[PDB]
Amino acid sequence: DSSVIYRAIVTSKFRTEKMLNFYNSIGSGPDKNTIFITFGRSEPWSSNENEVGFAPPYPTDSVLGVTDMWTHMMGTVKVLPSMLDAVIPRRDWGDTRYPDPYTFRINDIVVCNSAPYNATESGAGWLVYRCLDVPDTGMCSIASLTDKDECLKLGGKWTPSARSMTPPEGRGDAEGTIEPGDGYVWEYLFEIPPDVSINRCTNEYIVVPWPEELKEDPTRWGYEDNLTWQQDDFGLIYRVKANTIRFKAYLDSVYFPEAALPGNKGFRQISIITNPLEAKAHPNDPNVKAEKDYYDPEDLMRHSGEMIYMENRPPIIMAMDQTEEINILFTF
Amino acid sequence: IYRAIVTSKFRTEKMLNFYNSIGSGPDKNTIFITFGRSEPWSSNENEVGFAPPYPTDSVLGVTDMWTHMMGTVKVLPSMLDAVIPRRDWGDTRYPDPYTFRINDIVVCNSAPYNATESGAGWLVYRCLDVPDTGMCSIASLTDKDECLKLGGKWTPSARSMTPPEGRGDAEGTIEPGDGYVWEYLFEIPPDVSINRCTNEYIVVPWPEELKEDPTRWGYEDNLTWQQDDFGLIYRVKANTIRFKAYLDSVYFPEAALPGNKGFRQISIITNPLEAKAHPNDPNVKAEKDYYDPEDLMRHSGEMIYMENRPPIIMAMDQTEEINILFTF
Amino acid sequence: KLTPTGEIEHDSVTGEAIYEPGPMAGVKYPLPDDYNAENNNSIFQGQLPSERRKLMSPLFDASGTTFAQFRDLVNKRLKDNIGNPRDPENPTQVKID
Amino acid sequence: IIDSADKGIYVLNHDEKTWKRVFGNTEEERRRIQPGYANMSTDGKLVSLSSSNFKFLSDNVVNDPETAAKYQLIGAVKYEFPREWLADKHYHMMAFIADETSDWETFTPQPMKYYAEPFFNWSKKSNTRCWINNSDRAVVVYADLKY
Amino acid sequence: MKQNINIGNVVDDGTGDYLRKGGIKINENFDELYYELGDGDVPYSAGAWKT
Amino acid sequence: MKQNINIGNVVDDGTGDYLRKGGIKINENFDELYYELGDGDVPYSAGAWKT
Amino acid sequence: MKQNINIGNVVDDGTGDYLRKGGIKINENFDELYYELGDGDVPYSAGAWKTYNASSGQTLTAEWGKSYAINTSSGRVTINLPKGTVNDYNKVIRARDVFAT
Question: Where does the sequence pass through the membrane (chain B)?
């Protein structure tokens, strides 16, 4: 018989922690990672590639796989940390599109002010609430239990019966809908100012603020008001437990006209690289990390730096005067 | 519809950042490790086969763990090492001491049967090529080359004559003859070996620590052609860090006193802040090696990793040791 | 224990020194006198009672001790068991979720 | 320091009657009470005592037969809990209220605190619950202006 | 006063003195012996004189 | 002849002088430097002379 | 500088130095107490001095009981002696010619 048998878990926060760290690790020049993103392979996977249902071959990782990916590479683009943001899935009160706009489950996080139907309050950016408590009547995820409280006493999920009457409101620390009456209670987080909403937010994913960037303005994020008791905090992402970072990048034909030219079959596959070094005429010369935003693959040293992530797609065709955008996210 | 992958290196990469991220004082993480819960799981908890209840993650779960917490210990980055599973040439006890698979990593000189060469620390070789005769992981293929040309794994029939040798680039006992060929990596100096190495896991050197001595690690010899390189950990692709910590009764005599039923469960915490008499007073990150959970602010810092065990009983003048391995 | 002519003997090919339950292995011991006087009775009493149980060397005439902070205990010790070569046959420790 | 057994909360009606524990009469919730951490604040008609401490003796339930079975296991235990609403802000307060007509003599884990409810002084006159923020800031809460 | 640290006879013998009693048997012996010429911090090749 | 003792490392290990080796090894290391100074149970700040 | 080796208080108590740090606190202790008087493996009842060289500096200074046998050949030696000396006195210093430069 097994003598010792033990149990241990990592908190979801540690996901976040890695991220926040990982966010820290992109450097400017020195001793912190620098990131280039690359596309290539005009060459067709196979004649099918155009047709529907075609799945390009699953990429290969090897010094061989590297070389090949490194071989075809059309172009390269750097990444500034400010294009990297933490994000959580956006969910708006009252939104028809998505299921149960009016039915919220405990700890769900609800955005307000996002949309006209959503919007309670004018002259304010988007709001972010989390829903602490849900109506008592409902159904339990564990089929054995018909009581919310009993469902939760065991800890199984609970879905409430009664829909929300109104989207949550108030800066107020507790303050969902407590006095007059409702089944839901709502927790407030911070408010999002519109420009960032507009520029950052994807209707699936709100963009979540950095603790650092927060240190600058607690107000612009509406966080200044509260109560922390740890003093300054700003570690808000811990509270929301965002595990997801959004890479944003912008491709333009101009840096790489050659792959942009009419008749290019476009690039099949994508690759990101970290801390590559410049090309050098003399191999004894000291290595140089790459400042400029784009490099033709030539101007980069062969194989310098490490590429973490490789990708293969059906061909995508860049075109001149087009401006194409790439987003890649990460859950650590 | 596209296909995409992350390199195994990125496992390593996470670590290196994460390794970078433990700070001393400022603006970089500090790590405390905590034990607690004298309280018995259940009367059984002692008995064989007892498995403590699967832990819970929540502000509630936190609080409780934060409640019982006996003691706390910091971690210096020098107690954090990259490690890979140790496998020695020729060790009888474990299967196929003499049978190596492509890209396996072999330590030499570790033991007398291992040891080829006196007066040198441990060696680390990787095995490029394996004897031609063997077995394929794919039952359909009888050729190593065909098995591998397709990429199925191959198990070689013929054992190695000797553990590999020489600093040079693939050695491999290639000329005179053998089925194995060998690539050299670095040599491990003895002092680090004895103290760091767990017979399952050798300790792998940090690049910075590598930046200090290429020689003490035997890496000075090679060839990088990038100038300094030192990114060696990429080559071994270690995804696994070993936390080492030291518990001592002296810092926490109270839990050490005769008759304690010991601590059930373990928890690590990052960047807690000191206790303050006045909450308006500015926060202070925690330098000292141990803090009574009291001397730490309630709930301060984040605990990434929670743990539950059958009870372990500390005793004074006993000295208890903890190792933890994260695979990124 | 075995220490031919200059030095303790460690086993072949694996190089490990040899211990036995050396003579007078299990013995009561007297706790005879002095500690009570020698201490003066500190360590929240238990002066002789605390005693520092069992193995530890300080009697100072010993083969096995040499010089270290720590003597390990392979009993009451765990790698659990997983994965990699080396590792125990019996996990003595395991982990479930 | 202020210590030992009583941990008492006492209730006064009358002033002929006496001092009376209500929440006190437990042994357990005594331990919840802490000199540094535990604090009371009343609003109107409700009363809020802090507890920053929680652990349970009882809430574990045993035998976990399903996992006991699948793991070929005897014993273990379930780690179980009732639900209390904790402050998610760090230091993560827990509260207890008598909410009915003022007091009404039971205290309970609370559907939630209005955060940091203790330390908020109660005013009848111009009724507010005021406290001084850390980083030396005056916090005031009040109700006003139903149109 | 040489403060001889004693071992019982052969190795393995249950007798001895102590690693504890050796402590300060060891150290005073130093002090006593050393503080003669070494007279605190540093020994004097010119010798130690105590007024 | 100073008879330095080698030092074991941090863990139970069979390498190096085991303490009973050190026993009388250090105890010697005394008398040597000691006798050359002490000449018997007392050390001499003025040093010692040998007939 | 004597490298005095502690143990905590009473026997059997938690506090004490180490077996491990027992050494080299104890051994280097030998060396220094030796090294001034001994020079090498063996002590000198007649004492031991350590050559300061004309080659090294034009100056040495202040070692109280560390005696020197002095070279001026390479350069003139300017030897300064400990300053301010508190209430000590009694301290003899020894400088000599191991040869005459």
Answer: none
Kindly provide the resolution of this structure in angstroms, with one decimal.
6.8
Nearest CA among B103, B73, B70, B67 for reference residue B87? B103
Positive/negative CA dihedral, B295, B299, B301, B307: positive
User: What sign does the CA torsion over B140, B143, B144, B149 have?
Assistant: negative
CA–CA dist B62, A14 (Å, integer): 14
For tokens 């937010």, the residue is A201
Which residue out of E9, E12, E24 would a mutagenesis test of the C interface target, given it has the greatest number of C Cβ atoms within 10 Å?
E12
Q: Do E44 and G32 touch (CB under 8 A)?
A: no
> CB atoms < 10 A from the CB of C97, how many?
7
Domains annotated on chain B, with CATH: 6-81+240-328 (2.60.340.10), 82-239 (2.170.290.10)
**Measured distance CA(C56)–CA(G14) in Å, rounded:** 13
Question: Taking Cα atoms as reference points, which of D73, D98, D96, D94 lies closest to residue D85?
Answer: D94
For B280, nearest residue in chain D (alpha carbons):
D134
Nearest to D34 by CA among D13, D19, D55, D18: D55
Residues 6+ away with beta carbon under 8 Å from B175: none
Residues 6 or more apart whose CB falls under 8 angstroms from that of A166 comprise A120, A177
CA pair distance A2, A6, nearest whole angstrom: 11
Q: How many angstroms away from the CA of B49 is the closest CA of chain D?
A: 6
Q: Please count the helices (runs of H) and the strands (runs of E) in chain D.
A: 2, 9
Query: Cα–Cα distance between B92 and B98 in angstroms, integer?
Result: 9
Q: How far is residue G56's CA from residue G78's CA, in Å, rounded to a whole number?
A: 12
For residue B256, which of B204, B301, B296, B292 has the smallest C-alpha distance? B292
CB atoms within 10 A of CB A249: 18
Q: Which 3 state secondary structure label does DSSP give C17?
A: strand
Task: Kindly write down the DSSP assignment for every residue of D108-138, as one continuous string.
Answer: EE-S---SS-TT-EE-STT--EEEEETTTEE
CA A248 to centroid of chain Cα atoms: 9
Under a CB-based contact definition with an 8 Å cutoff, are residues A48 and A279 in contact?
Answer: no
CA proximity to A70, closest of A272, A313, A319, A283: A272
* Cα–Cα separations (whole angstroms), residue G33 to D45, E1, G19, G20, G40: 81, 18, 21, 21, 11
Give the closest residue to B320 by CA, choosing from B33, B7, B1, B28: B33
Helices of type H across chain D: 28-32, 65-70
Chain C residues with CB-CB distance to F20 below 8 A: 60-63
Q: Looking at residue E4, what DSSP letter applies? A: P
Residue C86 one-letter amino acid: R
Burial degree of D28 (CB within 10 A; 0-12, 13-18, 19+): exposed
Residue with the two structure tokens 């430069």: G101
Phi, psi of A158 (to 5 degrees): -130, 135
Which sign does the torsion angle of CA B140, B144, B145, B151 carry?
positive
**Token pair in block for residue F10:** 């941090």
Strand ranges (DSSP E) for B168-283? 182-188, 201-204, 240-248, 265-270
CA distances, D39 to each of D9, D33, D48, D97, D119 (Å): 11, 8, 8, 12, 7
Tokens of A75: 């172009």
**CA–CA min distance B53, chain F (Å):** 35
B299 to D86: CB separation less than 8 angstroms, yes or no: no
CA distance B277 to B294: 12
d(Cα A68, Cα A86) in Å, to the nearest integer?
A: 32
Instruction: List all residues 6 or more positions away from E46 whose beta carbon is below 8 Å from its beta carbon.
Output: G47, G64, G65, G66, G67, G91, G92, G93, G94
